[PDB]
Design a protein around this ligand. Sequence first.
Ligand code: CLA
Ligand code: CLA
Ligand code: CLA
Ligand SMILES: CC(/C=C/C=C(C)/C=C/[C@@]12O[C@]1(C)C[C@@H](O)CC2(C)C)=C\C=C\C=C(C)\C=C\C=C(C)\C=C\[C@@]12O[C@]1(C)C[C@@H](O)CC2(C)C
Ligand SMILES: CC(/C=C/C=C(C)/C=C/[C@@]12O[C@]1(C)C[C@@H](O)CC2(C)C)=C\C=C\C=C(C)\C=C\C=C(C)\C=C\[C@@]12O[C@]1(C)C[C@@H](O)CC2(C)C
Lengths: 227, 213, 230
Amino acid sequence: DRKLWAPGVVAPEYLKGDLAGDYGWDPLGLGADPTALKWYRQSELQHARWAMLGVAGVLVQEIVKPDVYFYEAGLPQNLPEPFTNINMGGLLAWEFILMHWVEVRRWQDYKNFGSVNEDPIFKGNKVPNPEMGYPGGIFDPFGFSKGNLKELQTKEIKNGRLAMIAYMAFILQAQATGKGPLAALSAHLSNPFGNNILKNIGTCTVPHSVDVQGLTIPLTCLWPGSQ
Amino acid sequence: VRPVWFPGNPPPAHLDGSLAGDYGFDPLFLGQEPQTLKWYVQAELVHGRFAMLGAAGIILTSIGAKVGLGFPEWYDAGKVVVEKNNIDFPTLMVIQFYLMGWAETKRWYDFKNPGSQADGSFLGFTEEFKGLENGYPGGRFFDPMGLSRGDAAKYQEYKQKEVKNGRLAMIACLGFAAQYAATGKGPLDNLADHLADPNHVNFATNGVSIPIA
Amino acid sequence: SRPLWLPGSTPPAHLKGDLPGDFGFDPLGLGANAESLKWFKESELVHSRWAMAAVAGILVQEIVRPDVFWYNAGKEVESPLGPLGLLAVEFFLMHWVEVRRWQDLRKPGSVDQDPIFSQYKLPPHEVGYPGGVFAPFIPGDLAELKVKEIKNGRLAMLAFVGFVMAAQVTGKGPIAALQEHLADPWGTTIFSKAAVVPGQAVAPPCKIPASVSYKGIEIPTPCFLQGLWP
Ligand code: CLA
Ligand code: CLA
Ligand code: CLA
Ligand SMILES: CC(/C=C/C=C(C)/C=C/[C@@]12O[C@]1(C)C[C@@H](O)CC2(C)C)=C\C=C\C=C(C)\C=C\C=C(C)\C=C\[C@@]12O[C@]1(C)C[C@@H](O)CC2(C)C
Ligand SMILES: CC(/C=C/C=C(C)/C=C/[C@@]12O[C@]1(C)C[C@@H](O)CC2(C)C)=C\C=C\C=C(C)\C=C\C=C(C)\C=C\[C@@]12O[C@]1(C)C[C@@H](O)CC2(C)C
C-alpha cells in the first residue's frame, strides 16, 4: 500500500496492502464490505487475465496475419481454413458447455474455498491453493511459484490492469478508425497531426447489424456518431 | 438498519419488519390500524397473486401470438374465446361469480373469524381450510408441497419473493393496460419495437404519453 | 462426506443423506416437510420406473421396428381389440394396482394380503419397496441397488424428456436423431437450430402435425410448449 495512487490522498481502511497492486484507490467505496472485496478481486483477476489474453490475441493475430480484421474475425467467413463458414451454433455450444463447467468450478472455489480443488474423475490429484484466484498446480506447471508470490502477483495484476485499458483502447480505436492496433499506430506514424483521436471521434465504422448465418446481432458502438 | 423505499426517511411505526415486503411505504398511512392493515395485507396478496397469474398469461399468450401461433392478444382473447367456442358470456360470468363467491366468502369469513371454515361444515374438510396466517392459508389444498411447512426461513424468503413478484406483476399489468391504451398493440409487440430501435421507439415517441412533444 | 450435486455445497438441513439417492439437491426445499417428502419419494420411484421402462421400450421399438414412429405409435398399431377395449382394460387394471399402491402409501402395512387367495401376503416392508413376489433374485445389497435404481431412473426421466423434445423438433426417433447428431455434430444441436437475440427469435418448427385423425375424430397433438421454444 506504499506509494499510493495520488500524493495527497489516504488509503481506505479496508485496503492496507493485503492484496496485490493495492494503491488504495477505491474512490467509489465498492470494496467496503469484505465479501464484495473478494468478489471484486476475483472479477478483477478474471477481467485482467482475459484482457491480457485479449490484447495478446489481437496483437499476435495482427502481426502474423494483418489481412484479418480482429473486429470482424469472429464471423465464420473470416474463420481459419478448417473452420471457415462453420456452424456457429455448435461452436457456441462447445464453448458454452466447456466454460460453464470450469467457471462453475471457479465459482465454487469462490463460495467454498478448498472444495473443488480435487479432480472429480481421477480421485488422486488435487490442486493446492495459496489464496483464492491463484490455484497453481496444473495451472502453474512451469513452477514459477514457491518464490516471490506477492511480487509475481503484483506483476500479473499490473500488467492486467494495463491490458484492460489497452484492450478497451483497441476496441475504441477499432470502432472509431476501423483498423487494428498496430495498424492504427502505423497510421498515426503516417500522419501524426491529421490522423489521431481528433477527427475520429464521431465516426463509428461498426455497422448497425450483421447477418451471421441468419441471425441479426445488434452490433452497437460504445458511443454515438455516424451510425 | 433495514431497506426502506425512500432512504433516510424512517419507516412509520405500524410498519415494523414483520410483514413480507415491508419497506415502510405508507406515505398516506392507510394501514395505520392493525385490522385495516390485515385487510390490506390480504388485499395486496390477492391482487398480487391474481396479477401474477394475469401477467404470466398475458406474457404467454403474447409469446404465442408473436411467434405466429394461433393466439389472440390479451385485449382480444375474450371475444375470440366466447365466439370460437359457443360460450354464453353471461352464463360463464355468473358461473365464475358463483364459484368465486363461494371461494371468496369462505376466505372472507375466515378473515372475520380465523378459526372458522375448519369446523367440518363445508364437506368434512377441517385442516385444509384452517388457515396458517392472514393471507397465507396453507394446508393440504392450497399448499400440497408443504413449502410453508418444514423450513421457516425458506417460508419467509418465499413470502418476500411472492409479494415482491406480486408487486412487480401488478406494475406489469398496469403497464400492459397503459401500453394498450397508448400503442394499441400487444405487450411483446411493444417489446420487439423497443428491441429493434430502443431509441426513437419508446413512450416519449408515442404522441399520447408526453403530449408536449 | 456423501457425494453431492455441488461438491462444495452444504446440503439442506432436511437432506441428511438417509435416503437412497440423497445427493443434496433440494434448492427449492420441496422435501422440507417430512410428510410430503414421502409422497415425493414414492412419486420419484414410480416416475423413475415408468420412465425407465418407457425409454427401454422406445429404444427397443426403434431398434426392431424402425418403420414406426414412437410419437405416432398410438395411431399406427391398429389392434383388433378396439381402441376403447384397450382403454377399458388398462383403466380398470391400472386403477386396481394404483389404488393398491395408494393404500400402501396412506396406510403402510395395510395392503399386503392377496385378496383372492388367502395364503399369500407380502412381508412387512418399506413404503415404495414392496418386495416379495415383486422381487425375487436380488443380485447383491439392497441399498446400493436402490441407489442404482433411482439414478438410472432419473437418467431415464431426463432421457424421456429428451426423447419427447427431439421427436418434436426433429420428427425422428431417439436413435435416428442420435445418428443425425453423429452425422453432423456442429450442425444438428439445439444450438444450431435455434437462437434468440435481442431483435430476433428463431424457434425451430416441429415436425409433429397439429392434429391426427385416428378413426373419425381429431386428436389434438400439439408440440409441448412451442412459442416458449428457443
Ligand atoms: C472490471 C475490472 C476491475 C475490477 C473488478 C477491479 C477491482 C478492484 N480493483 Mg482494480 N483496476 C482495474 C480494473 C478492475 N479492478 C483497472 C483497469 C485499473 C487501472 C486503471 C485498476 C487499478 C486499480 C488500483 C490501482 C487499485 C485497484 C483496486 C481494486 C479493488 C478495490 C476497488 C473496488 O472495490 O472496486 C471494485 C470495482 C468494480 C466493482 C468494477 C467497477 C467498474 C465500473 C462500474 C466501470 C468502470 C469505469 C469505466 C468504464 C472505466 C474506463 C475504461 C477505460 C479503459 C476507457 C478491487 C478488487 C485497489 C486494490 O488493489 O485493492 C485491493 C487498488 O489499489 N484497481
Ligand atoms: C413492469 C415494468 C415495466 C416494463 C419492463 C415496461 C417496459 C416497456 N414499456 Mg411500459 N409501462 C409500465 C411498466 C413497464 N413497462 C407502467 C407501469 C406504465 C404505466 C405508467 C407503462 C406505460 C408505458 C407506455 C405508455 C409505453 C411503455 C413502453 C414500454 C417499452 C419502452 C419503455 C418506455 O417507453 O418507457 C416506459 C417506462 C416506464 C413507464 C417506467 C417503468 C415503470 C416504473 C419503473 C414503475 C413505477 C412504479 C413506482 C415504483 C411506484 C409509483 C408510485 C409513485 C408515483 C408514488 C418497454 C417494452 C412504450 C412502448 O410501447 O414502447 C414501444 C410506451 O409507449 N410503457
Ligand atoms: C412404459 C411402458 C410402455 C408403453 C406404454 C409401451 C407402448 C407401446 N409399445 Mg413398447 N416396449 C416397452 C414399454 C412400453 N411400450 C418395453 C419396456 C419394451 C421392451 C420389452 C417394449 C418393446 C416394444 C416393441 C418391440 C414394440 C412395442 C410396441 C408398443 C406399442 C404397442 C404395444 C403392444 O402391441 O403390446 C400389446 C400387448 C402385449 C404384448 C401384452 C403385454 C405383455 C405381458 C402381458 C406383460 C405385461 C405385464 C408385465 C409384468 C409388465 C408390468 C410392468 C410395467 C410397469 C413395465 C405401444 C405404443 C410395438 C409397436 O410399436 O407397435 C407396432 C412394438 O413393436 N414396444
Ligand atoms: C476482459 C477484457 C477483454 C477480454 C478480451 C478478449 C477475451 C478478446 C478476445 C478477442 O479479441 C480477440 C483476442 C480476437 C478477436 O478476433 C476475437 C475477440 C473475442 C474479440 C476486458 C476488460 C476490460 C475492463 C476494463 C477496461 C475495466 C476497467 C475498470 C476500471 C477502470 C475500474 C475502476 C474502478 O472500480 C475501481 C477499480 C475502483 C472504484 O472505486 C472506482 C472505479 C473507477 C469504478
Ligand atoms: C397497479 C395496482 C396497484 C397499485 C397500487 C399502488 C401503487 C398503491 C400505492 C399506495 O397504496 C400504497 C401501497 C401505500 C399508500 O400509503 C400510498 C399509495 C401510493 C396510495 C394493482 C394492479 C392489480 C392488477 C391485477 C389484479 C391484474 C390482474 C390481471 C388479470 C387477472 C388479467 C387477466 C387477463 O389478461 C389475461 C390474463 C388474459 C386476457 O385475455 C383476459 C384478462 C382478464 C384481461
